Structure formats: structure tokens, C-alpha cells
Amino acid sequence: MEMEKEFEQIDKSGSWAAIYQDIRHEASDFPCRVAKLPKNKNRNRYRDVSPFDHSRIKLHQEDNDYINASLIKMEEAQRSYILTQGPLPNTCGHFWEMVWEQKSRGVVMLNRVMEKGSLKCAQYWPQKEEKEMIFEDTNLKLTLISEDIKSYYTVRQLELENLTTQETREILHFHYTTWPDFGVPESPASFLNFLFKVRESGSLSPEHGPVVVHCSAGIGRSGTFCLADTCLLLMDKRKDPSSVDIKKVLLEMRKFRMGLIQTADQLRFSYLAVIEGAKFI
Ligand SMILES: Cc1ccc2nc(C(F)(F)F)cc(N3CCN[C@@H](CO)C3)c2c1
Ligand SMILES: Cc1ccc2nc(C(F)(F)F)cc(N3CCN[C@H](CO)C3)c2c1
């Protein structure tokens, strides 16, 4: 059963909601005790989106190691990702500290800072070359070097400096700017072109740390990005690409972060992206 044939059946029967609820029912549940400590209340954007203790990213400054971020480690696909929430006004320094400590080369952002009148993410990078950001709490400086604005996404070149050592690193910011305010994109073509730009940058390679991916909560749109990338890698690696079961991969990813793919529409879109992206590979 090619994925295309399955998709046709699901679409005809209108069963995307039933299949999505099955995934929810089967998903892993593990503790999130650290996330729930009182002193970490202001570090969580949403009270019902927490990282599991087993897979959470620890900040290395002693103090408070907590950030709402999870390491998704896909063993068969040989790729890792860090999924995180959109930074809060008080956690932008922790975010960049994470990127520094984890040796990430890329940040993937799948939201806009404001959507439907409402703040989804803090403005955690500089909009102007001449107006750099200093995160005084984690002793980091961030400068916009250049950007390449296109119709569906923007790629920025950032310089991140550890002010303690004066070491600097180039970080690439991949910003998908056109996800609709409601629902999902009608066609995955632009999402796929975005994904291919991330890939081609080398940001997902094993010589770097895991890419950091976020949206607002770091589980819906972010989950589509990692699910589509992993299923496409599994397709190219396996002798038989039609043995890739996207529901099984998503369940695997949900061992590492709760909630990945938040709606039936997102699940459908993930299928569509993997179908069309497989056609290109
Ligand atoms: C033909 C057909 C069959 C089943 C469907 N099932 C869902 C669901 F996943 F939400 F349940 C969503 C659909 N649509 C509407 C069209 N525009 C799309 C948004 O871009 C989503 C959809 C469409
Ligand atoms: C030749 C080639 C090889 C690998 C590829 N890998 C990906 C993806 F998604 F895996 F990164 C996406 C591709 N393309 C680019 C062209 N436009 C297409 C849809 O608009 C998507 C692609 C194309």
C-alpha cells in the first residue's frame, strides 16, 4: 500500500480525525516533573505542553537548568532534532544558551511573532544589522549579518558570540513565514522547498548539533517539519520506501515530546508533504 493509495482511502472515508485520535490514544506518557516545578512556571508558554524529563535539554549554567525543549533522537533515520517552544521574553537568553551549548548550526522557525492579533513568540533575533542583541543573563551577543527574504520564507545569517570567551559562531535562521493563521497550507510545495534549503545548508548534518525547531508551542507545525524530514530520510534509506508508515514514525517521535501534530489537518498535511517530497527524491 503506497502512501498515496492509503491517503486516497482516508480522504474518501473522511477518517483523518479518527486516525489522529488513535494516535493520541496510543501515544507515550512519561513524567514531566522538572517542567512542573514552581520555579519553572514562567519558563513555560503553555501549561499543557511540557518536555518529558527523560529527553529534556538541560542548560549547562548551574542556577536553573530548565528550558522547554526536547531532544528527538531518531535512531534508524540517524538524525536528531531539538523541538522547543517559541521563546518567551524572559527565556530568549536561555534559548540562545541552548543553541550555543548544543552546538546547533540551524534554527527553524515555523510561525510569525504575531498571528491573529496575538503574540506567539518573542522577537528573539535582531531585525537590523546595526542593532545587535545582548542577552545579559547568559552572556551572549547576537548580530544579524544578512538576510535573504523570499516569497514563502526567509533565511538569515546570524553571528552568535559567547561574551565569556569571545568565541563566535555563524547560525542560520530558517524562517517559514507563510503558514496560514488557520489550518495548514493547501499545498506542501513551499514547505518542501523550505525543507530542502535547510537540508542543503548542512544544518541537519551529523557534524553539527541538532537543529533547533520551533513554532509557538513546539509540537504542531514543528512536529510536521521533523515528521516529514524523518519519513523522507527513512524512504531513501530503506530498500522499500512504501514500508514507511508515517503513523508509526510519529508514535516514535512522541516518545520524545508530547503532542507532536496537534490536529487532524496537520496529520493530513504531513502525509501530503511526504507524498509530494518522495516524488522529488
Ligand atoms: C478533500 C478532502 C478530504 C478530507 C479532508 N480532511 C481534512 C481533515 F484533515 F481536516 F480532517 C481536511 C481536508 N481539507 C479541506 C481542503 N483544504 C485542506 C486545508 O488546506 C484540508 C480534507 C479535504
Ligand atoms: C531534485 C531534488 C532532490 C531532493 C529534493 N529534496 C527535497 C526535500 F523536500 F526533501 F527537501 C525537495 C526537493 N524539491 C525541490 C524542488 N521543489 C520541490 C517541491 O516544491 C521539492 C528535492 C529535489
Swiss-Prot record:
The keyword Phosphoprotein applies. Its EC number is 3.1.3.48. It is found in: Endoplasmic reticulum membrane. The modification S-nitrosocysteine is found at C215. The modification N-acetylmethionine is found at M1. The modification Cysteine sulfinic acid (-SO2H) is found at C215. The modification Cysteine sulfenic acid (-SOH) is found at C215. Changing D181A: Substrate-trapping mutant. Keywords: Acetylation, Endoplasmic reticulum, Hydrolase, Membrane, Oxidation, Phosphoprotein, Protein phosphatase, S-nitrosylation. Substrate binds at D181, C215, S216, A217, G218, I219, G220, R221, Q262. The modification Phosphotyrosine is found at Y20, Y66. It is an enzyme of class 3 (hydrolase). Belongs to the protein-tyrosine phosphatase family. Non-receptor class 1 subfamily. Interacts with EPHA3 (phosphorylated); dephosphorylates EPHA3 and may regulate its trafficking and function. Interacts with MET. Interacts with NCK1. This is Tyrosine-protein phosphatase non-receptor type 1. It comes from Homo sapiens (Human). The lineage of its organism: Eukaryota, Metazoa, Chordata, Craniata, Vertebrata. The gene is PTPN1. The chain holds residues 1 to 281 of 435 of the full protein.
